[model samples]
Target chain A: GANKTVVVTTILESPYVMMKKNHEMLEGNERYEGYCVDLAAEIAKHCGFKYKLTIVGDGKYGARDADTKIWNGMVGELVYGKADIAIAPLTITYVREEVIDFSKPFMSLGISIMIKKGTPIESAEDLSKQTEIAYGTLDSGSTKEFFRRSKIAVFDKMWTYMRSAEPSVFVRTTAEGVARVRKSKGKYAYLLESTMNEYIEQRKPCDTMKVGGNLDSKGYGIATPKGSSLGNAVNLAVLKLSEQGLLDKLKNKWWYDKGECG
Target chain B: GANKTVVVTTILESPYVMMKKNHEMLEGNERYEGYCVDLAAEIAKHCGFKYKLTIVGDGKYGARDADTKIWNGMVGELVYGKADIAIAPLTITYVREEVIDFSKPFMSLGISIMIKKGTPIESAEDLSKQTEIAYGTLDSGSTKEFFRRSKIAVFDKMWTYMRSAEPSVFVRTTAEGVARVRKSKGKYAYLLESTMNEYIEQRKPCDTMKVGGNLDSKGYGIATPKGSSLGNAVNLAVLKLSEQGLLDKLKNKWWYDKGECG
Candidate 1:
């Protein structure tokens, strides 16, 4: 196992992982480039290893089925011995941690509100108390799971409204949620992670803005199977990069410097 | 073992854990009152268990003995089976995580620069470039370890100076570091976790402030022995509370609402 080239599983997420414009002319790793792509290179160099990148077959972050009890997405790849490491925007979650190991957070973000630029919404509380402007989260993600599992009065109420909302408030993807907010003409808002919200705010069209402090704080981690030997090295490398400010530089390079809007 | 009141190990830190005003006239958990105390209660309530709070004997967060190969502090309590849980401002670190289990972070923070107001230092780079003001972190803590292990240029340079400064730059406790910064009349700065730095800045002295962005991001977690069955329940409880904004409320009650400077 030690002699083999590591197999890494990641999802295709804008800014985190994406195909290059000229990918048809490129080969192997060169065909892909983004935040996680650059981060994978740094990790390999630090740990003295070569690896191959493969997108998760299911195109999901990772979730278990209620009826089948089977894991899917990048997480399942590690659980089933199909991948050696998962270096992506995977969240460091309680249930996920029980099934796999996660490096300390490489990036910290929280559930935040995103709105069309001229909207008057400023906080979650305001949205929760009124019904004029509709809001929802990307389907099948931590943000939605948080609402479904939350016991707090405010969030529980939001969940109640969302689950029963006519026309289904939840969208199939983050891009869809953004599109809804953009087309609603100040009549809708999107609940997404701060990292993505901020990235979108900096993109062209500049039609949306993130409002209020994050409703909750959490982080994303690089993951591996529960007892992978490579765990310690990757964990330490994350801390080293973080303390050295390399993580900060990477964020600016991918999220800000590459931004189309000023 | 399962029926007994779970023994909890914690450290004494202002605003997180501290003696009540009438501690001499109180008993058991009654003698303590702070953020961690409140959190412990909520965790127990959610987990449906009984617990007893005991201060760690060594008064250290947790560190491995260089020559003896033994652990000390709250961490040692768990590793050695002296405590069933640790609820304190204990940081979630790579070395510590390897030996114990931590719930997802209950609170997030970062190493930050604490400067007495008007010190003229805006960031770590400013501190690294000048000797006009001396700065150091508490001894035997994650902040110090961060500097010592850092491979980044600016932090590495800062660590070099801190390790050999005349009169010893390191402090035995966070209180001592705060005292040095307060008494230095702009000649000394303190590097400590953002949680403590922000807490002290809100207290009576009112003369100090946290400047620039946090140097790095991380968090404090509720801890348990490796593979402790209670792990999952407690982990879920933290996420539940965080999403409910109860953690935010606790911080406000203990830090801002208690502020004398404001």
Candidate 2:
């Protein structure tokens, strides 16, 4: 009778958190499909708390406005008391850390490239020299930010093209960017995080594949506001999963173990 | 004499393009070591491009900016006139397509959670409800963006928490994130991409393991500016590599194989 009521804000992105194709048939959290959904349930089981799931107000999950001292979206929601806990592919950043707390990361990945299978390209250097193929990424997101903060030479050059390339090379969202690549055939490639790319490759009518290597470095973490008193337990929980082989099991199930090999 | 000179820009991010840890021991691109360096040469052999490896001025590998017209990093260098091609793990996005071009992706992966073997976390939900452990990520990168853009309740709440969490829940770069987790004695976890995470897992003192499912969807590809004539040639080259099994072979060498286990 003394459980802490934790509210968690999440995302509706596919494979990680989104409605199942049969969403109309499922109810409650069952309506939530994607890897993160299952992961969230497991987390709640061990933490010993009652929780609620609420999507953020603005579609943008986390960012600093510079003008507003408050943080919102999934991360913002937790800091502002709209939620007590979070369980999605949330990332860690210095600016945000100044305001909240993050449980040890549950996932890691990097900014990756996705393109139609037929596109002429093998490596970043090839793309640098090619003219016919076009590339871009989601607008106002973290992938975009990777280029913005680059200290390396080539990444800096990429930043310039991204800025003034006209028609705005950035997409409003990953979906739009992927759609453009699909419709454009092999001529277009979309830049995004690797997690989303893997999910797209799993779906039918998929035409894209990842190439080269990741550009920037980063990973995802479960987060709570500072002193939420849940960080230690959650961090330990993640470590336990790793030790028990559940993490490896999950990886195989999601990445390499598709039995049918479509 | 009439052959097109494709402008290619790239980032010296490391192992992929960075000055070799022993850079002073070698010279030029030859000075580099690591999977990416070899992979680049392999891709170049397949793609048949006479290329120059120019660095992006800004240093950041990939990202977007609003203030300046420049993309401002390696990805930007390609967009700007600074270079003609790109490799590395440059991701594809819409905004970038408005200016530069990209080729068919050759790999698939996403951001992941890396925790010491003893962590108990199996998913984001687990991390949120527990308290004995803690985690975090590198600031302002793709991982950060996933949480920022997430709409699901748990991640949304996480965004709030991570943004304000104390004891400084963020890292400056992805590599540092991994090191922290690997040496954490089960108290810390690093969030990063699957490729790097898996590679690290196989190394000595490799106590780190990937946990749960990937957070989002995305991939890797070669990037180039639009209208460059080298596109078709490079595309054909990649197909040839795929056909010859070279691409797969490279994956085994750089990603699927090697590391401390080898």
Candidate 3:
């Protein structure tokens, strides 16, 4: 596999993978800039592999359709052998773990609430017992899947309420959920991963805040198709980068040093 | 201060400070059984001091009245020389810091959102911009004071909205706030410390949840009057307890070991 170009599937998410303003003049990976671009370079260098970075044809993190019996997004790309690896902010969950292999967490995070500064909610328990304000998560991410399958009494109760919520609580993307929070005028709250929540908190307007501690704990991992030969090399590279403090350095470079909010 | 019993002020708060259920069979310090009582015993043992524990007479954490310019609550007790030390879950804040000395933080906490499940609200940002659901903090406490004094844009705008919201959103006690959320059916959210919020989340009925990450960061400190002789000893004792894992042990003992909610 030394001379083979590893096909890497990624999503075009901010701070992860983004088309450069001058992307038209660039080719391959040179057209992109963000955390994952840098991280992919580091991993490839450490693993001694040449890789081709390709955007997921469908702009999604990946989720399996209940009715269609098919996977979509980066997960689909990996499952169908179109890509050898996924280098994005894809969450590690029990479902994804069954079909794919994830390296030890590269970044730790948890489900969090994104609210307008003055809303009264301090914890999920508050939402579990109420009905006036409507809440939801990204329709296709791990956060939504978490609530959908959670057996923890608190989260299970929330899922029951959300599944039947009027006006349909779920949103197709984080941007939509965020837009809902911004425009709902205290009537809606977006539940998302803490890393993204913190990133958004430091962005412009700064009208929103991440409140309370995370509901549960988890992390993101570099993913590969099960039994792929690249698994061991990528995993070792992630561990090496984590121990050398490169992950923290990359986070600081993306989240805070480049923060738009004062 | 040698060979004298130190006058220690505390408050009657559940889990932190409580009149023992078997109080009729005990007297003085023995009548209290809670996190603070156990912490006081540990601090006294480490610092080699004899102390008398008394609940703050006014049942407050202390705040200076704007009109009278007088401090009240446990803070006032320490300020006026009525108590030599305060062994309780008192918050550490700048205004209080100006008048009293605080040991290293014994506990870390932050402002959180408290909502009944099924509420439409998910984050503080949702509440900040909306008019449908009303939210507030304890009428008096560091949390309320934080919002009152915050200069952060999101929080400042929220303060403006909460300051003028109709139907008098604020509650006199955390219990009252919790009750308001439970009874409002999703119309009210109570902002309180994450510690209290998490404690409530594990209690019976399990109807409320702490949503989002904390609005800001801060901690609880064992407080003493400015220039008190016991300050250094108490601070060292806290650091020792933290380093020895005693603080984590105590938290597990109070929060999870005796947890009533399954």
TM-score per candidate, chains pooled: 0.88, 0.50, 0.53
The candidate 1 chain A region of ten consecutive residues with least summed lDDT is A236-245
Better of 2 and 3 by lDDT: 3
Considering TM-score, which of the candidate structures 1 and 2 is the better prediction for this target? 1
Deviating ranges (above 4 Å) for candidate 3:
A1-262
DockQ of 1: 0.48
Backbone clashes counted, model 1: 0
DockQ list for all candidates: 0.48, 0.02, 0.01
Q: Is candidate 1 or candidate 2 better by lDDT?
A: 1
Query: B106-170, model 2: which lDDT tens digit per residue?
Result: 45566678888979887777766666667776554556655655566776776777778788778
**How many angstroms is residue B181 displaced in model 3 relative to the true structure, after the best TM-score fit?**
1.1
Please report, as a residue range, the 10-residue window in candidate 3 chain B with the lowest summed lDDT.
Answer: B239-248
Question: Compared with the true structure, what per-residue lDDT tens digits does model 1 show for residues B43-86?
Answer: 99999999999999988888777899898888999999999999
Model 1's CAPRI class is: acceptable
Those runs of model 1 whose alpha carbons end farther than 4 Å from true positions after fitting are A1-7, A25-27, A42-50, A62-85, A98-101, A225-237, B45-49, B65-71, B76-84, B225-237
lDDT of 1 by residue, A72-157 (tens): 88888999999999999887776787789888789999899999988989998888999989989876577887888888787888
lDDT of 3 at A143: 84
- lDDT minimum window of 10 residues, candidate 3 chain A: A236-245
> Scoring model 3 with DockQ, what do you get?
0.01
